[PDB]
Enzyme design. Sequence first.
Site, mmCIF file in Angstrom:
data_model
loop_
_atom_site.group_PDB
_atom_site.id
_atom_site.type_symbol
_atom_site.label_atom_id
_atom_site.label_comp_id
_atom_site.label_asym_id
_atom_site.label_seq_id
_atom_site.Cartn_x
_atom_site.Cartn_y
_atom_site.Cartn_z
ATOM 1 N N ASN A 1 -16.383 41.025 -90.301
ATOM 2 C CA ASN A 1 -16.271 42.199 -91.177
ATOM 3 C C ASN A 1 -17.634 42.829 -91.310
ATOM 4 O O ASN A 1 -18.460 42.376 -92.118
ATOM 5 C CB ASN A 1 -15.727 41.843 -92.572
ATOM 6 C CG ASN A 1 -15.693 43.084 -93.539
ATOM 7 O OD1 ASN A 1 -15.878 44.226 -93.106
ATOM 8 N ND2 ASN A 1 -15.453 42.847 -94.831
ATOM 9 N N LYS B 1 -18.324 45.595 -92.617
ATOM 10 C CA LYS B 1 -18.450 46.427 -93.840
ATOM 11 C C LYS B 1 -19.068 47.770 -93.521
ATOM 12 O O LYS B 1 -18.841 48.306 -92.447
ATOM 13 C CB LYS B 1 -19.268 45.716 -94.905
ATOM 14 C CG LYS B 1 -18.654 44.385 -95.284
ATOM 15 C CD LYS B 1 -19.325 43.761 -96.477
ATOM 16 C CE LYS B 1 -18.766 42.324 -96.661
ATOM 17 N NZ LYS B 1 -19.361 41.600 -97.806
ATOM 18 N N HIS C 1 -9.627 43.886 -99.463
ATOM 19 C CA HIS C 1 -10.908 43.180 -99.527
ATOM 20 C C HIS C 1 -11.453 43.298 -100.952
ATOM 21 O O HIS C 1 -11.280 44.335 -101.597
ATOM 22 C CB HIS C 1 -11.906 43.771 -98.524
ATOM 23 C CG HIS C 1 -13.199 43.038 -98.471
ATOM 24 N ND1 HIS C 1 -14.224 43.265 -99.372
ATOM 25 C CD2 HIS C 1 -13.637 42.063 -97.641
ATOM 26 C CE1 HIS C 1 -15.229 42.460 -99.098
ATOM 27 N NE2 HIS C 1 -14.901 41.718 -98.054
ATOM 28 N N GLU D 1 -14.262 43.960 -102.318
ATOM 29 C CA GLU D 1 -15.101 45.117 -102.668
ATOM 30 C C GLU D 1 -14.251 46.364 -102.983
ATOM 31 O O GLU D 1 -14.618 47.192 -103.800
ATOM 32 C CB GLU D 1 -16.093 45.424 -101.533
ATOM 33 C CG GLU D 1 -17.260 44.456 -101.467
ATOM 34 C CD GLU D 1 -17.810 44.247 -100.052
ATOM 35 O OE1 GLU D 1 -17.545 45.086 -99.141
ATOM 36 O OE2 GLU D 1 -18.533 43.234 -99.859
ATOM 37 N N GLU E 1 -11.091 34.904 -100.600
ATOM 38 C CA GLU E 1 -12.470 35.194 -100.958
ATOM 39 C C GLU E 1 -12.840 34.538 -102.271
ATOM 40 O O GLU E 1 -12.315 34.908 -103.314
ATOM 41 C CB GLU E 1 -12.705 36.703 -101.105
ATOM 42 C CG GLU E 1 -12.247 37.558 -99.933
ATOM 43 C CD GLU E 1 -12.643 39.025 -100.128
ATOM 44 O OE1 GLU E 1 -13.865 39.294 -100.118
ATOM 45 O OE2 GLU E 1 -11.749 39.888 -100.326
ATOM 46 N N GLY F 1 -22.867 36.343 -104.933
ATOM 47 C CA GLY F 1 -23.928 36.964 -105.704
ATOM 48 C C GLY F 1 -24.021 36.424 -107.116
ATOM 49 O O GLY F 1 -24.638 37.043 -107.987
ATOM 50 N N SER G 1 -19.192 32.820 -98.111
ATOM 51 C CA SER G 1 -20.377 32.969 -97.291
ATOM 52 C C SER G 1 -20.274 32.015 -96.124
ATOM 53 O O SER G 1 -20.285 30.800 -96.305
ATOM 54 C CB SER G 1 -21.626 32.665 -98.102
ATOM 55 O OG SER G 1 -21.775 33.647 -99.095
#
Lengths: 245, 250
Positions: free
Chosen positions: B11, B13, B95, B97, B167, B173, B213
């Site tokens: 991906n 992005k 996804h 995001e 995910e 983060g 990750s």
Amino acid sequence: MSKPQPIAAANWKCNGSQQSLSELIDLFNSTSINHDVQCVVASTFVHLAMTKERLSHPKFVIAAQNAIAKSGAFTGEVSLPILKDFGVNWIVLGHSERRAYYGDTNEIVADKVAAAVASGFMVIACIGETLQERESGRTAVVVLTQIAAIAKKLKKADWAKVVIAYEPVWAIATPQQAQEAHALIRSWVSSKIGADVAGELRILYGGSVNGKNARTLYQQRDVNGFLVGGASLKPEFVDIIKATQ
Amino acid sequence: MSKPQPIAAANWKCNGSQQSLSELIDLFNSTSINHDVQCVVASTFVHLAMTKERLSHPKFVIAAQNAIAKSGAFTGEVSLPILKDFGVNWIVLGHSERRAYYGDTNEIVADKVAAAVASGFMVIACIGETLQERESGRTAVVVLTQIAAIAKKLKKADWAKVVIAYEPVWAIGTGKVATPQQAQEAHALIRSWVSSKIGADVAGELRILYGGSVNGKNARTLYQQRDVNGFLVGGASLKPEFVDIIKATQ
């Protein structure tokens, strides 16, 4: 006395096949245009590659229909540096459908316009009021606050890269209604930015335009061309381009 | 059965230049891979044309990162029929995001998935819970609610076109790190639900990819987990180390 160079803009929106778009581009290509006008084609992101390759008419440029400001972790989006790397130098920002459906708020449109200007794009920034807002007599305050948000993030020099597209969402109009809207925008820019910016500013009409009403509309003092929806997917776009003399 | 065909999905992005993505494609083209795995490169819409022309490896397919169901008056968007006419047959949907930033609710993802399946796409449908949902003891609630909404719009037969990506947004983060055992707990939860709700045949064939990750160093121990069927990879997929990730699925 002159009107600045007119712009004829084709917003294809979310439409097209490789086949159907390729024929339209051939049609544009074979079109003879004998005056100073910047023709703009805004296709979906997917068709930018074929458009960039097949559209050769020297009066045409390609545009994007949206972007975000920076590359990064934004699955599904396209950014300005990606578009600039791809050789796209025009972009349509703040269209009503995005303000309506995709969270383009006054300030977010403003940030996008400013980021696009700063990396060197030519920007068609859309403003305009809904049906409810017009009937309430809130046109001026709605529309001018939209542009004022954009202006807050710009300096005087930046306006040379900016085109305003007035979208009368409320009719989704007479030449008189369009003219008074454009004059309303231009008068604002003259008072708020300066007369040295406003006289040169292209303000495009973005309501439903076809080959038959375009001419009467362009003759208006403050109309500098068009941001065309559905008719830009058709051969009659060429007649709209021609209405710009 | 034993593990179905794994998938290694890149991906990219909102990244890439014509130059950087080409060099990366050239490498993918020159890669030899000795086992059966489906590789997928999901690029930005702008780059789909150049990826289509240049990527030639028979184990790689091209994907989009989002779409809407139908063409029309949606300035700035890309529709499923536009992608299909363009010859794109994989798509990543829902996804994290987009769920977080761009309005992809449970039902809207479900509408997109159904439309894409119906249109003939292979769909990577993403799910997963935030730190706050997790800390509040809502991991299973959130993960099952998200997949149930998608299921609600599908027919049993449609699952052959469906790939789930988990995910762990709670680990993205936040300065928390998912262990391979944590990934396994989430996948097993997803598979057991699919087994009870949809069917044991479907649950057995379903690829559930890990979407946290992923790098060259951790991929192998993640894939060793029983219910891990491959990867949906972020940052490393823009790097030569994405090749090591594909190879960690042997």
